Design a protein around this ligand. Sequence first.
Ligand SMILES: OC[C@H]1O[C@@](CO)(O[C@H]2O[C@H](CO)[C@@H](O)[C@H](O)[C@H]2O)[C@@H](O)[C@@H]1O
Ligand SMILES: [Ca+2]
Length: 554
Amino acid sequence: APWWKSAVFYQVYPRSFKDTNGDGIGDFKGLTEKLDYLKGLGIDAIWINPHYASPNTDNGYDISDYREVMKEYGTMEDFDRLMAELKKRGMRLMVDVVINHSSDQHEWFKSSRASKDNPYRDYYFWRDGKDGHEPNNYPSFFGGSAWEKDPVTGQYYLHYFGRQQPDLNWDTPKLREELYAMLRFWLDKGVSGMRFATVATYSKTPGFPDLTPEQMKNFAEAYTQGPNLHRYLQEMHEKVFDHYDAVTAGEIFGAPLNQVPLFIDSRRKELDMAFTFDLIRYDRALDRWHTIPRTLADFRQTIDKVDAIAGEYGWNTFFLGNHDNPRAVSHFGDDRPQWREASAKALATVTLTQRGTPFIFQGDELGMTNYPFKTLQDFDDIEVKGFFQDYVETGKATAEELLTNVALTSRNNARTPFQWDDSANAGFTTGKPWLKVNPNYTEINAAREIGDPKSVYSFYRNLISIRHETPALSTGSYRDIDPSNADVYAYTRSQDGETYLVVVNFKAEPRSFTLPDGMHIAETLIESSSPAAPAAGAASLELQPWQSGIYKVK
Ligand SMILES: OC[C@H]1O[C@@](CO)(O[C@H]2O[C@H](CO)[C@@H](O)[C@H](O)[C@H]2O)[C@@H](O)[C@@H]1O
Ligand SMILES: [Ca+2]
């Protein structure tokens, strides 16, 4: 059982964590200042979003030099000190690895775009248009065609994401060797983990035939069907990860769940663990902007399908939130002032008793909410400007339809500054924050949470302890008591003849729970929103609105 199977991770979007120089952008110094806070919470390891030199058309996901640090975050010396200060606390760092595409300002692309005979030409994908139009019908995730004509050579380069994010050509051995050398540069600095963004799209289909209309309906899935993908990931492991001790994590965006085992089965020598989208997008329409009503029954059944593809040799991450999705309490909980803390704790109990390695998103430990967008600029983000181009400019929807829906699903919901206290701009910055702070910072902030044994924060800290001390709760098997139940989420975790029972009321009303025939409460480890723990030997539970609990059973 490697260290990573029982670790609890915390994801820090540095741009919005803590500013230390007034420019309104979070930075490395600000993260280094808060390690004590993170340690005190119980956090073993941090995954930071892209921290490399970038023009920031996509807040670090368009990388212009893989070997320099983002100017906004600090210098290489600031990154080294972060590493050092993490190590002092026996903490580990996972970095984000963005090698499906680079920025169009990367030196490689500047060279590549110069002529068709340039030595870098095949570091990207260049093709002639067909029939006066693009080379084929590929759509981009961030608006319009995935192909962009370059007047310099008259050909089109491929970009699955933004126009300023040209896809890297993995079919070219020289480029793969460069990528590997780049990974060693960071690994040699002692980085403990790497998360590969959109790891499933690295392999492109030879010939670039047009997508079928079915394929066009789910293009994301088509872009994960490159015929050399597993070949390339296995090569990366042989030449890189085999020689180091880091954990690898794949963001498997767009792939069908049944293919996930190919990425994570320890025996195949590709990656260690999976970030999947089935759960967190379980109520998102195919357009990635509308929502579809779902029940708890939908929620638990997805989790069960997801757990099942881990098998014996695979391993999952678990998360309810990240920098690409709405806030966990607003999305899966109830964010109204009277149910917010109660449901946030109930979500905490879920997160920390899932099988897999949990990732907690910055701010969820405080019960941070979605942002109340009013304006146009509140929504500012390459992906929504993409939705405008594809849905508004084309007359498929009105701006106000877009914004009503995007208010609920926008990435910007997760990127509002972390709420440290009740000072100006919640103590995030002394300047003017890059995105506005949520007004509810006056009720929802770290300083107020940490001082209160009854807070969301304190509930998270207690859960993390209980998990750290209970093997079954990280590496134990998982079993859903009743997948068709849409009121109360019940499951067991077991290891080595010990069994724990997690019960979570998802209704804002009293509910009852009857334990499995022959099973009885032995001890109560923790509850939220309960006025009294069950009696030793209880065969059922009386549950308050939003109540959660962990029990040892016999
Ligand atoms: O937000 C659109 C879509 O992008 C994904 C692809 O994995 O997210 C990763 O890659 C993007 C493009 O570089 C980034 O904008 C994003 O921040 C990054 O995590 C999906 O998760 C997401 O649905
Ligand atoms: Ca700053």
